[PDB]
Design a protein around this nucleic acid. Structure first.
Ligand SMILES: [Mg+2]
Lengths: 456, 576, 576, 99
DNA sequence: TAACAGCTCTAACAGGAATA
RNA sequence: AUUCCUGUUAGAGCUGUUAAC
DNA sequence: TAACAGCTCTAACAGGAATA
RNA sequence: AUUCCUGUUAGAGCUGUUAAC
């Protein structure tokens, strides 16, 4: 009775890179081959711009210089790869801004920060952008720096400065790479350089890497929510992200609102149907009208009867729907035996119940070790000694745990904002949660949809 | 009339209820609405003369919609969503070619884009299970009719104007269920959709409908007036002495946005002695599910198709353990049936009241409410006097897993019982944090031989480790090894969850040792965690995890005793 | 044309195939045929003019039929099953009242007596899965409107004479599937059923038959001619370029009883250049059953409704063993997976050939064909030389129960293996009678201590019994106690069946001791049989039937060894 | 088994054209007639009960420049009840581009 | 279509009588 | 054949699994 | 609608860095 | 906020089970 169903370890998903080469290590492949989207010239050159107070601009130009020159990893050398220099590794020059492409924040921002007013501080930071606004053609990306003296307005109740800035500059189409002193002073340098460089390339152009072995006929959907603590009650702001590989070479990753008020994170019949309608209409527009054949709706909470009925009735019979729920905190945890020195291989899925499975999005990864090749690497070794798996509670499917598990595993590796090897959750869930935070901070965003490069 | 009253009214007398659904239900089935249909024609018209690529502009874009509407207004056409526009654009595009008009209207509303939704699969169920007999739908779509074919597997008798006399005969001979389209199927020559055709009514259908009205009461949904012929037919139809015994409820999605024609017709009907009421019941799809929710004794065969989510999908079986194998922390509890004690109270009791009685009396027994008690009767007599106790009997839990899954009170009770059993005869202390239970090595008895293996588990490079002590930089915080033990219901099985933790003697001062808890747990890798879990299994069970079926009973010296049996080996499964 | 060639011909090209179902197919749907309608009409009228109780005398009685027909002949009416009779009796009973005639024809052919059989469901599946697009059937009642709607779950577009031009438009715009009734639904006044109405054809429908003639080839079933209008439409239909592209086979249940008009019609087409063929395929139901059988890649969703017997019903679960308990003779074999040896032969081998090789060589191993061998490789080398052996490898039987259930060779092989294992290390002799294996106490070693308990089992009033010996009145027959041991596959489990028997040393001379076998078994009542079964369990297993899991391996000293484990306690279940 | 391409080279395709004629409406471009073989081919295709159900459309670059036989055939088809039409468009390639 | 495996049935006989 | 079904001796019928034809 | 049980999530902080 | 998710402290949201109203 102690013998469970046999598991199968899904191998490490391959990532499409420069010249359609595949390598499961993102940074190693980027150094070796280059970005997938560099095959075409979406970014001609990464022209930057600075927005910071006059005192701390030297930090911005210093960090840009550090991006220009190669760096070596000091911490987590088990996984990271030596930086080859932005021009060498991303095959695109990184242009330092000239005098007019380099703005100065108003001194009134300091007064507002001393006053402890987050809303006015974000408004003033946005209003400082007008000088760059004329030369909107001049600067592709903008590196907004925030001095530590503004910490009092960085994060407090009912507010978040980063989300407010992102929601204020998203309709203005300019990507923004916020830089805090936190990662300006962090000891290891290759860490910050790799993260900032991949973010800069994604926000200026896009697609640093693309997941291979992706059927063009599947659209993956992830719903996630956030809470705004009202004085009387609460507001549950839920938003949905969508990923798919279209007929064109440009892999698409978008997010959108879901509309009024919600007291619970469970969508009703009409709201679920409307969101799903918007989703497959977006897919059809990106697929010249072709119907999706596989749909994956990942939700952090269980689907009620209304949600499942809305899913069933929104599509036609030809498009099978894979309604899956992701559980983050679970009691179970495993230990590999042959007992192994390193924890269980990443990607092992263990069918517990006919509808509930354990997926090991965390765990040892093979073939991505730089030093002592062949040794396994545990991404979260610093944080945890063992990997905590997630629970997939399939609410609607025809058959095959492998089909959804491999899709989730491949969706855990395409977060360009993530410096590390993978993510505990699929990019759908994490982007839906990020956009949920954004919408909760700024409710007047429900009108439009946005690409990933805006909010990553 | 409030909405809750409408549901009660539609439930008290649901056997005599005509339905009236015109162009409003088709919106939610994935069928383009008339407003969307006007844009499709404008798109074709603009792209045709002004030679533009059809692929280049999508009609639901705002810019392209504005440009096309501006072009239409340039040639003097009607301005915006105004009467005599839909028919105008039809007669403009198709220049009086009713065959081509019919073919286009068939293609736009064809039976391939239609996906039935719960509101649709509910009206057809009402038709089949024979509550509503007459459904006059002013829609030319093949859905509600497709819904009936899907839900019951039979053929539905639809009556287009192509026959137009069958409905008058069919209603009279009571060969229900009837679906008379006042404007007929698109599969036939006459469609009656343009404004000039919308001023007259077919003589025989006028009759069909009147017959239906005397016999039943009308519920009209998804209808916003704007039609003169249907409005005058309804006005005449009230003229009849017993027009709707069951009253007519016009369900609009919003009373505020309802056209004044509907309101004045309702006032006229009320002035003519009928009890016609206008109610706002939100969307038709939401309303149909509520009406279906209030339906009693719905057949299972049709309800398996009405609500496909109600049946449980994805019952995908798991394979065998054939052919590296992860070793989880789950100990399977193979106990299937247990015995408990029940006390009957002369007055109703609350689970909170029993919890506070537990807190005050502190008996040597367990109790929960559902009052099921595990232990000795005299303890319950201490808790409850003879006056409040009526009788004390026995309870049998034939299926423990189903019982704990059904009621969370049973889950908590069985978890507490198994925890008490496991720590009954052992020196390991039993504490609780939040709603979880912790078995922690005691401070005084830390030098026991039964802990020595645990001492080996934490040891560094094979030397002797430490099990209990004081934090390196804390004033009074004391720390020990511990295991969080929980009950997990998985499918049809129960398992015991063990997780190694670092217990802190002060409950509220755990965070001050966080770094220490981190520092002690930095290097508890797979081998070390394997060793600690094996040591904890040995401590909690007394037998190594090979082929063991150790059985533990709680309160063995009590009349009501629970005897569980948990396999000493944690869950494992070799890879395929 | 032979029926099989026609099936291949259709299966070869079923994509483009109109069907022409007549009133013969509805014969099975349970609807009254033409003759049944005629007899109902005579009986309905005969009872009214001559006042006789309607329900007192039935209609399918031979005497009442003869009496009613004699009465009809008395008034000069047509004699017997002759033309212009069906219409004659209709026009006589209903005296030119087409509304009442329609109502009666609706009631007789109503949609409550119809029970769809395999033929209509298979045709509806062909319609839905889109092989046949046009079905013109001269019927009336919706046997197919119902049946395809039930299996596909989607509504069907039926065409009739009320519109009658819908078919041509739907054909022209490829709105398949179309089901055009040449004589129209009974819900509609146009019925076209009397002889005067059967001389003309609707212009638009007639037009459709010719346009559809060019597109597809026709298969007409359940049609016996006798209709002038349909025959002339087909002749007109036959008179066009490529009228039937794939050819038209007029299928009849019997070629001999086919009317000369058909055969005349079939010969007539052939002269006009088309490949029309007349075939006999039995009844319509059998024809469509075979056609569906030859259909490839039929969707599971619709096939679950086409053949409801194909899905497995009555999966009624069994309850728990909760709460007198019968003790059967079944020992559960909890072994799930075993290992076997496989030899690859350079030339094909027959199970009979392997059996005779076993008989000649007599090796110390087991073999079966599927060649799976259990034992030592050198034994197989003795059986098969190196020249005929290509390789020797391993085989794993992950699910033993499913494997034995699927293949009876596996059942016999596993039964022989478990029998050899059980008698490997024990003195009890192993024999076979028919195909049943017997474990019998040996003659010489009958005084063993392990038999003493068995000696107690057969003893009378608790004394010492006898286990082996000679018959009371037989010249040379010797008798002994024995147990027939068999393998039984029950559901998803395997069990060992033990039955106490009286083995006779001469195989063919068992009957001469029958009385003795009777006499020894006269008083082997429940207690005595319980004792003998317990003693045999102890002998065969070495452990008493309490909480035991004895494991036995066959050929333990061999590379390929099978290790089974059988619970020592027989099956039991307490009453509910 | 579509798509099908057949050249008249003007009775092998004549039966096929008649079979094709009922199935779908035909449009003829780049042809002025002037050939009696195809003329009788089309006239024989017209007679059946459901011939060119969608319609017969003649597209010439200029209506007045077309040969009289084409207009005669169009009038004959219209009299027979078929929905044949003679429409004036541009060059065949330009017509197909606009389509 | 020819064997082979099991599961189950009937077709001819024979045959003695309800825990002793 | 007043009954009952316990055995014996045989053959078929279905399923299969191979080899074909 | 008021408690109570479990399962799971986010909301604020804090926080150190890949088997030693 | 270059990143990662490990914990702490809280509240909700769902399910339920009772008592009602
Ligand atoms: Mg960023």
């Amino acid at each position: 009775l102690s013998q469970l169903a046999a598991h199968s370890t899904i191998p490490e998903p391959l990532l499409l890179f420069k010249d359609n080469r595949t390598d499961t290590h993102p940074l190693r492949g980027l150094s070796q081959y280059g970005p997938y989207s560099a095959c075409f010239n979406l970014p001609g050159q990464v022209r930057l711009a600075y927005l910071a107070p006059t005192e701390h601009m030297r930090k911005l130009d210093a960090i840009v210089r550090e991006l220009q020159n190669p760096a070596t990893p000091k911490e987590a050398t088990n996984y990271y790869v030596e930086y080859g220099g932005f021009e060498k590794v991303f095959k695109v020059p990184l242009v330092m801004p000239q005098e007019h492409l380099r703005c100065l924040a108003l001194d009134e921002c300091h007064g507002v920060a001393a006053n402890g007013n987050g809303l006015a501080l974000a408004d003033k930071i946005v209003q400082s952008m007008s000088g760059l606004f004329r030369q909107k053609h001049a600067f592709d990306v903008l590196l907004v720096y925030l001095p530590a003296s503004w910490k009092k307005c960085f994060e407090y109740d009912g507010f978040d400065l980063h989300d407010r800035i992102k929601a204020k500059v998203a309709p203005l189409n300019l990507p923004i790479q916020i830089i805090n002193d936190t990662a300006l002073t962090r000891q290891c340098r290759a860490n910050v350089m790799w993260g900032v460089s991949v973010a800069l390339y994604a926000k200026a152009g896009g697609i640093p890497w693309k997941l291979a072995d992706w059927d063009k006929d599947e659209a993956y959907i992830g719903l996630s929510y956030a809470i705004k603590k009202n004085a009387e009650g609460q507001e549950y702001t839920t938003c949905c992200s969508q990923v798919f590989d279209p007929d064109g070479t440009g892999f698409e990753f978008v997010a959108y609102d879901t509309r009024d008020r919600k007291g619970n994170p469970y969508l009703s019949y009409q709201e679920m149907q409307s969101v799903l309608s918007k989703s497959l209409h977006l897919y059809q527009s990106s697929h010249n009208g072709r119907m999706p054949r596989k749909i994956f709706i990942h939700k952090t909470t269980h689907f009620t009867e209304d949600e499942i009925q809305g899913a069933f009735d929104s599509f036609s019979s030809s498009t099978e729907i894979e309604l899956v729920q992701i559980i983050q905190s679970t009691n179970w945890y495993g230990l590999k035996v042959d007992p192994a020195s390193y924890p269980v291989d990443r990607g092992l899925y263990q069918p517990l119940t006919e509808s509930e499975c354990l997926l090991w999005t965390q765990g040892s990864v093979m073939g991505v070790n730089q030093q002592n090749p062949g040794q396994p690497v545990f991404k979260e070794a610093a944080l945890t000694p063992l990997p905590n798996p997630i629970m997939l509670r399939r609410f609607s499917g025809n058959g095959g745990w492998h089909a959804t598990c491999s899709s989730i595993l491949a969706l855990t590796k395409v977060d360009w904002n993530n410096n590390t090897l993978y993510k505990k959750l699929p990019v759908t869930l994490v982007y839906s949660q990020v956009f949920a935070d954004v919408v909760k901070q700024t409710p007047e965003i429900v009108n439009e949809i946005y690409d990933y490069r805006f909010f990553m | 009339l409030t909405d809750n009253e409408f549901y009660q009214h539609y439930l008290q007398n649901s056997q005599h209820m005509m339905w009236f659904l015109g162009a409003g239900t088709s919106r939610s089935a994935g069928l383009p609405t008339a407003s969307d249909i006007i844009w499709d024609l404008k798109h074709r018209y603009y792209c045709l003369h002004e030679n533009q690529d059809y692929q280049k502009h999508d009609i639901n874009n705002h810019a392209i919609k504005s440009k096309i509407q501006s072009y239409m207004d340039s040639k003097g056409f009607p301005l915006q969503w105004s009467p005599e526009e839909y028919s105008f654009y039809f007669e403009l595009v198709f220049r009086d070619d009713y065959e081509a008009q019919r073919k286009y209207l068939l293609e736009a509303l064809a039976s391939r884009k239609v996906s039935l939704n719960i509101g649709h699969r509910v009206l057809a169920a009402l038709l089949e299970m024979n509550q509503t007999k007459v459904v006059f739908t002013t829609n030319f779509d093949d859905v509600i009719e497709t819904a009936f074919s899907d839900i019951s597997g039979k053929h539905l008798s639809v009556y287009h104007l192509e026959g137009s006399y069958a409905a008058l005969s069919a209603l009279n001979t009571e060969a229900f269920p009837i679906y008379a389209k006042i404007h007929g199927d698109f599969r036939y020559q006459k469609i009656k959709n343009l404004t000039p055709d919308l001023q007259t009514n077919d003589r025989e259908i006028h009759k069909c409908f009147l017959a239906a009205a005397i016999r039943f009461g009308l519920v009209v949904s998804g209808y916003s007036g704007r039609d003169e012929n249907v409005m005058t037919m309804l006005r005449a139809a009230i003229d009849q002495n017993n027009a709707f015994p069951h009253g007519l409820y016009w369900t609009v999605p919003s009373i505020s946005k309802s056209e004044p024609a509907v309101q004045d017709l309702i006032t006229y009907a009320q002035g003519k002695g009928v009890r016609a009421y206008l109610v706002e019941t939100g969307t038709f799809d939401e309303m149909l599910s509520k009406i279906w929710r209030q339906v009693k004794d719905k057949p299972a065969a049709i309800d398996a198709k009405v609500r496909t989510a109600r049946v449980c999908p994805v019952s995908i079986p798991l394979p065998g353990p054939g052919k590296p194998a992860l070793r989880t922390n789950a100990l399977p509890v193979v106990t299937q049936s247990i015995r408990c004690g029940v006390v009957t109270l002369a007055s109703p009791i609350t689970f909170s009241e029993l919890k506070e009685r537990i807190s005050q009396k502190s008996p040597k027994a367990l109790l929960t409410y559902t009052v099921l008690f595990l232990g000795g009767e005299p303890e319950i007599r201490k808790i409850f006097s003879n006056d409040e106790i009526n009788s004390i009997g026995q309870y049998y839990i034939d299926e423990i897993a189903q019982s704990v899954a059904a009621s969370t009170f049973l889950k908590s009770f069985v978890e507490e019982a198994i925890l008490t059993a496991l720590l009954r005869e052992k020196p390991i202390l039993h504490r609780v944090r939040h709603r979880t239970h912790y078995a922690v090595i005691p401070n005084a008895s830390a030098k026991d031989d039964r802990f020595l293996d645990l001492r080996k588990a934490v040891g560094f490079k094979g030397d002797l480790g430490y099990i209990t002590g004081n934090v390196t930089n804390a004033k009074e915080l004391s720390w020990a090894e511990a295991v969080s033990i929980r009950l997990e219901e998985r499918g049809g099985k129960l398992w015991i969850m063990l997780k190694p933790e670092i217990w802190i003697k002060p409950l509220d001062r755990r965070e001050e040792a966080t770094d220490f808890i981190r520092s002690r747990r930095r290097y508890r890798f797979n081998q070390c965690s394997y060793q600690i879990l094996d040591a904890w299994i040995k401590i909690l069970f007394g037998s190594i995890g090979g082929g063991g079926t150790v059985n533990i009973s709680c309160f063995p010296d009590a009349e009501f005793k629970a005897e569980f049996e948990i396999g000493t080996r944690t869950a494992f499964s070799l890879g395929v």
